[PDB]
Amino acid sequence: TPLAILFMAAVVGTLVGLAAVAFDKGVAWLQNQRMGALVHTADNYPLLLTVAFLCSAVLAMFGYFLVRKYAPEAGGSGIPEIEGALEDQRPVRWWRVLPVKFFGGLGTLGGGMVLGREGPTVQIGGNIGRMVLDIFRLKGDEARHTLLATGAAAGLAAAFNAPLAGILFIIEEMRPQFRYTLISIKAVFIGVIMSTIMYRIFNHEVALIDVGKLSDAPLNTLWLYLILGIIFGIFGPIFNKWVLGMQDLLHRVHGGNITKWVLMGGAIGGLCGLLGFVAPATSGGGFNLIPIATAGNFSMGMLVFIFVARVITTLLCFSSGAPGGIFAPMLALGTVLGTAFGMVAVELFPQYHLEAGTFAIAGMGALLAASIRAPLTGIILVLEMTDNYQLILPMIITGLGATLLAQFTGGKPLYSAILARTLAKQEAEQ
Amino acid sequence: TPLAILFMAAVVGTLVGLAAVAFDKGVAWLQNQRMGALVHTADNYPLLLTVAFLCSAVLAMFGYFLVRKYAPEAGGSGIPEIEGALEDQRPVRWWRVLPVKFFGGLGTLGGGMVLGREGPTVQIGGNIGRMVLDIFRLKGDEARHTLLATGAAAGLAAAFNAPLAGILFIIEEMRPQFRYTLISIKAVFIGVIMSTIMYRIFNHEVALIDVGKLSDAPLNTLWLYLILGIIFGIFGPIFNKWVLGMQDLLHRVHGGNITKWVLMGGAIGGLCGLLGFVAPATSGGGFNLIPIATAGNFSMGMLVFIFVARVITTLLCFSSGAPGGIFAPMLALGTVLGTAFGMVAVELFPQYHLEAGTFAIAGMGALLAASIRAPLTGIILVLEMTDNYQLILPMIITGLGATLLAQFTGGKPLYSAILARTLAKQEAEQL
């Protein structure tokens, strides 16, 4: 028991790391095979349109048919039904939700949707941490929570190569009333470290969005980051309302009717699959359009069209009950709004010698701190994904001036809203 | 009021890191200026060994005369005083120790000594986090020990660029079964991540001391890393008793006698300067020979020579009370034994088709796992320093076997044995 739960945490770490890197490799393989089949025939334009449309719609409806038939809790980004599962409601079951998330989320994520590559694996981690817990028959009460939390943290630490954010996101989703034991936090630590080690064995790159060397921001332009924090704080609790107002709408237009729900899912996967070809910087995981939008490459007249198309696809494709989270779409939806304000700022203030590149890095985690209201795992997640650490002072300002002002306007966090809605729908069955 | 204690921990995390990179810039600048002064006048040997015994020895008398006149609790490895300060004893008075530990441990470590740059910055972290708590005059015993553990976890993470291994030493060097609040662990994390961010802001590096990607480790050769763990397990507590015995012998040969103590410190610094000049890899911070000894460069006789010489000089120049910590040179003293075991293995089993590099990495976090008895921060520290993550299973096998044999035969961790010895000694001196 004492020095065995640490070995259990090590098994959780290596299994979640291997599953996350296999999920990433399968998604990359499906995307590369899809674009290879696109280049394989190059005769005319509408045939290429329909072969990019019907494919990745069949691949999306495969994932939709697998989720809406076998396990209904896999739809909805994974962090709901693991935050409640950290409590004693909405339980997890690896015999149902673990295979469907992997083998029907890799298809609908690598097909070309605008879904996230963190949401599936952050629930894959918790379900593995429950699976290898219960298959050893290690009975307990706190042991279940400290073998579920290490999986729920490892599923992010092996997802974004960020252990310092992978532990902080599972810290900032707890209750500070009761204090915790030293064996539990060590069981989280060992699982996080084994998962990021099993991630770093396969892949070697220490960055994830290679923007590279940038310019520092002096103290004369520091207040514009606080102004951008005010913009992100007044934009924070509106996107959550848009998600929660599109979710009941997409459920209303296809109430019940699984064989119609998967046709709606195919029709919404084919749209973003076509948009991945006709104009590729509006759909996908976002990492194909973040380093293009950090440096100045997008025009101002095209940037608002990119932002509007981006929000209208990341509302309408995720919220229909799809296997994907909001860490990968939001980290591009924030940086587009960041580089727009950066272009306006460099056009407005010539006496600062500033560029819009640092304003794009200083707006990635701003939306992640204004919507999820977790401002300590946005900043370090950004500074571990991209590597320009030098804008740490114009990142904490636009984080804690965004969430502090969004607290005053009134708005619940997103994962404490989807979980609240499904907790109402749990007791509202009879 | 907690948000304020989180901002307090942010002040600790931004002061440490800056202080650690200032310490690193100072020790590198002093070593570079000594290397430049050795080649300015480069006529012959006897007019250069005398200046190598003059400088990097007056720089040792400087640190010794600092640490013996102003604050005597700053002398020796740093971190056992922080281990005492995490309990309700050994008061870390920052006005006495922070103007002496930095300004003497940059000198006695830029003097080419055998010591390491982890101890004198983990105590700098703890003393900074104890300084900022009284300068804001917000009291509380649970409001304290969250700015002391914050600095003690900040110092190591800014020393070795290891924000993962910087927390787990504080995890594994605290009391078990004691429940800790979420505000405390968040105040630890804020200091850790600020202390690695404002470390990596200056010296842009992908890692610390590097070999590159070595070979992989197949499943057939895991039966030999356990034997290496057996060797480090029977070596560890003997090394810890060697440290304590050399400390007792040096205090026997110098009881009090501050002028003779700083003269012995000058002689013991000039010794390191001379042996560092005549041989490029037998002294230093244990970082200038780990890439040399990991790849195949040395012969086996030269390897046992550098191992015996470093075993001599680590005990001989650490237990004299100089401001330096044995947490960096233990890595080099372990990896010379690891590459010696690899040199035995490439001759005894040539059909395994392995080289001595994959056994030179698994000796770094083995002596640090045996003589310190914290294996889950010696497994991760090596993988954070050298970026060859592809051997995690041999490091786990070697570390677990080393701590298993070190616990079976017996012995105490060094950073707790030194603390227990000085806690007995101070009450033996008083009353």
Side-chain angles (χ1 to χ4, degrees), chain A residues 1-174 176 179-430, chain B residues 1-174 176 179-431:
Chain A
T1 304
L3 284 186
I5 184 172
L6 192 135
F7 178 53
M8 296 313 292
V11 184
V12 183
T14 176
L15 283 175
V16 170
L18 278 153
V21 70
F23 181 74
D24 205 307
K25 280 303 167 191
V27 160
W29 176 44
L30 289 177
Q31 199 69 260
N32 205 354
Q33 185 181 320
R34 208 268 307 270
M35 307 171 290
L38 193 140
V39 186
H40 152 73
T41 317
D43 44 358
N44 60 305
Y45 199 76
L47 170 66
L48 263 294
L49 282 188
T50 179
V51 72
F53 164 69
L54 192 44
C55 204
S56 55
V58 54
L59 191 54
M61 81 173 56
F62 164 66
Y64 265 99
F65 163 68
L66 195 60
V67 61
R68 284 312 301 181
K69 177 66 166 308
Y70 288 83
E73 83 261 47
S77 158
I79 294 173
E81 309 278 320
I82 206 70
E83 281 185 4
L86 266 168
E87 319 158 17
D88 294 351
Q89 48 256 35
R90 279 308 298 196
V92 292
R93 39 175 186 174
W94 75 90
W95 45 69
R96 277 303 174 217
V97 80
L98 194 142
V100 58
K101 180 59 75 188
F102 201 86
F103 289 119
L106 58 90
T108 181
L109 178 71
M113 283 190 150
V114 71
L115 276 187
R117 62 162 298 276
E118 199 275 345
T121 178
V122 78
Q123 204 180 22
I124 279 177
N127 295 311
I128 286 175
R130 180 56 150 82
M131 170 189 82
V132 75
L133 165 75
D134 190 48
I135 207 66
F136 272 62
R137 294 183 181 89
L138 195 148
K139 296 300 292 300
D141 214 348
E142 197 85 40
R144 180 177 77 257
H145 286 152
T146 191
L147 268 299
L148 181 53
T150 176
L156 166 58
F160 276 157
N161 210 343
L164 305 168
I167 309 154
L168 268 183
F169 180 64
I170 210 57
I171 281 166
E172 295 277 82
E173 295 309 308
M174 299 302 289
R179 48 187 191 273
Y180 309 132
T181 70
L182 206 50
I183 186 59
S184 42
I185 189 59
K186 194 157 56 203
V188 174
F189 254 101
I190 295 307
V192 162
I193 289 159
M194 288 322 146
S195 45
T196 182
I197 278 169
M198 276 283 160
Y199 180 72
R200 271 137 167 182
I201 279 179
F202 279 69
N203 311 135
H204 278 286
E205 185 47 62
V206 296
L208 202 60
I209 304 103
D210 51 309
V211 195
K213 309 315 160 203
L214 267 76
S215 316
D216 201 290
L219 276 78
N220 284 166
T221 177
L222 206 72
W223 60 272
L224 274 163
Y225 293 93
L226 182 53
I227 289 298
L228 184 53
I230 297 148
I231 308 303
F232 269 93
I234 74 159
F235 195 69
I238 309 192
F239 193 82
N240 314 115
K241 293 210 305 175
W242 280 3
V243 166
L244 273 301
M246 283 274 309
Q247 194 166 1
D248 49 351
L249 190 134
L250 285 180
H251 182 33
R252 171 179 75 89
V253 302
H254 283 70
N257 213 323
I258 315 293
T259 184
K260 268 191 66 58
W261 206 334
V262 307
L263 265 294
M264 191 260 299
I268 206 53
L271 169 72
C272 49
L274 184 146
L275 261 69
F277 171 65
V278 62
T282 180
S283 315
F287 302 142
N288 319 304
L289 67 96
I290 295 169
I292 302 177
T294 54
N297 301 77
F298 286 163
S299 90
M300 184 46 207
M302 204 170 55
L303 202 52
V304 301
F305 152 75
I306 282 173
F307 186 82
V308 160
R310 191 81 185 160
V311 61
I312 203 54
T313 189
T314 195
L315 281 169
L316 183 45
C317 179
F318 150 74
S319 190
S320 50
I326 319 296
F327 273 91
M330 256 177 195
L331 277 180
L333 195 49
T335 193
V336 167
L337 203 56
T339 186
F341 183 76
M343 281 162 196
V344 174
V346 65
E347 202 269 332
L348 194 46
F349 297 91
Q351 62 261 54
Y352 284 156
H353 287 205
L354 79 163
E355 79 266 14
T358 183
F359 273 60
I361 312 284
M364 293 175 70
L367 185 60
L368 210 70
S371 86
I372 310 182
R373 282 185 196 277
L376 285 186
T377 183
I379 294 172
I380 298 151
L381 187 64
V382 162
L383 294 170
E384 184 59 271
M385 279 163 100
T386 182
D387 216 358
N388 47 3
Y389 273 109
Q390 85 278 339
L391 54 107
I392 176 63
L393 174 66
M395 189 74 205
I396 181 66
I397 289 298
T398 184
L400 293 182
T403 177
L404 161 74
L405 174 141
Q407 194 181 89
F408 275 106
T409 75
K412 309 303 292 299
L414 173 63
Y415 296 133
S416 160
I418 302 185
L419 180 59
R421 157 180 288 243
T422 197
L423 265 189
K425 282 298 174 190
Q426 169 58 241
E427 55 89 30
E429 291 298 317
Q430 50 179 1
Chain B
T1 195
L3 171 45
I5 185 169
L6 195 138
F7 176 63
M8 289 190 155
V11 183
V12 184
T14 185
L15 280 168
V16 189
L18 266 69
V21 77
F23 179 77
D24 189 273
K25 269 182 184 173
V27 63
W29 177 81
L30 262 177
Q31 287 169 278
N32 193 340
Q33 201 166 6
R34 183 161 40 89
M35 210 67 53
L38 265 188
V39 292
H40 269 299
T41 61
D43 42 358
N44 58 332
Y45 282 81
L47 314 181
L48 259 67
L49 69 90
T50 55
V51 65
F53 203 70
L54 173 83
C55 79
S56 51
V58 61
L59 196 61
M61 312 205 179
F62 178 63
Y64 266 95
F65 172 60
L66 277 156
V67 72
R68 271 316 296 186
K69 192 173 186 173
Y70 268 57
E73 58 259 46
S77 55
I79 207 164
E81 286 287 333
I82 295 301
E83 290 292 321
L86 286 183
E87 304 176 358
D88 206 58
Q89 66 259 21
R90 300 299 308 167
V92 282
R93 48 176 184 176
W94 67 94
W95 60 87
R96 279 290 149 88
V97 58
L98 264 164
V100 71
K101 172 62 90 189
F102 179 44
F103 271 103
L106 66 94
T108 189
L109 200 38
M113 271 192 176
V114 69
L115 314 168
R117 44 173 316 276
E118 195 281 329
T121 184
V122 64
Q123 197 179 4
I124 271 179
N127 299 348
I128 281 288
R130 198 39 166 88
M131 162 178 101
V132 75
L133 197 38
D134 285 331
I135 212 167
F136 282 169
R137 74 188 72 101
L138 265 163
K139 273 83 64 179
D141 54 334
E142 288 291 328
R144 216 165 58 245
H145 313 157
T146 67
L147 266 73
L148 190 43
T150 287
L156 158 68
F160 288 153
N161 207 339
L164 268 184
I167 318 168
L168 277 193
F169 196 74
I170 310 299
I171 291 302
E172 297 174 316
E173 298 283 349
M174 277 173 74
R179 312 198 185 179
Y180 307 130
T181 53
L182 192 137
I183 314 165
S184 161
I185 189 65
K186 186 148 49 191
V188 167
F189 269 98
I190 285 304
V192 164
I193 305 163
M194 286 285 157
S195 193
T196 179
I197 282 177
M198 288 190 180
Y199 178 74
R200 290 149 149 178
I201 192 180
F202 294 115
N203 41 5
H204 301 75
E205 212 61 46
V206 78
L208 200 59
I209 43 156
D210 71 310
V211 203
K213 188 210 300 177
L214 271 163
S215 49
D216 307 66
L219 67 93
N220 193 278
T221 176
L222 285 179
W223 83 281
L224 216 61
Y225 292 88
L226 193 45
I227 301 304
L228 176 58
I230 292 283
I231 295 307
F232 268 111
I234 54 174
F235 181 70
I238 311 191
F239 187 82
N240 267 6
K241 291 175 190 174
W242 277 345
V243 177
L244 272 74
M246 194 72 61
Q247 180 161 341
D248 176 277
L249 196 139
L250 286 158
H251 191 70
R252 166 190 95 100
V253 80
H254 278 77
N257 211 357
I258 313 297
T259 43
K260 276 282 185 166
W261 202 347
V262 302
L263 196 147
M264 195 199 70
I268 210 65
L271 177 50
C272 310
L274 263 43
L275 61 96
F277 175 58
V278 66
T282 167
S283 169
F287 281 172
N288 309 117
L289 62 92
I290 282 187
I292 306 184
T294 307
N297 301 312
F298 294 156
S299 158
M300 194 200 170
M302 188 61 67
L303 214 44
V304 289
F305 166 69
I306 182 182
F307 176 67
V308 170
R310 279 199 78 86
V311 153
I312 283 182
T313 187
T314 295
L315 323 172
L316 172 57
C317 318
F318 162 68
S319 285
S320 41
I326 308 302
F327 205 71
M330 191 170 282
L331 300 158
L333 198 41
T335 195
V336 287
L337 204 74
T339 191
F341 203 89
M343 212 71 65
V344 173
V346 292
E347 194 264 331
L348 212 160
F349 301 102
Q351 48 98 10
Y352 275 166
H353 315 322
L354 53 86
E355 80 262 52
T358 182
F359 284 96
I361 302 298
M364 296 174 74
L367 189 55
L368 197 141
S371 157
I372 323 291
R373 291 176 186 272
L376 271 301
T377 185
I379 286 178
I380 312 162
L381 189 47
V382 184
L383 303 169
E384 203 75 30
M385 280 181 305
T386 175
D387 210 49
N388 49 3
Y389 279 104
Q390 82 277 335
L391 52 96
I392 176 63
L393 199 51
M395 290 214 56
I396 289 171
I397 285 302
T398 299
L400 259 67
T403 188
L404 171 144
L405 191 46
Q407 196 34 71
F408 162 72
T409 70
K412 275 91 180 180
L414 167 70
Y415 290 144
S416 199
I418 289 296
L419 173 63
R421 174 184 270 253
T422 181
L423 275 179
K425 207 178 65 187
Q426 58 98 18
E427 67 99 19
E429 294 141 9
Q430 82 157 10
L431 69 96

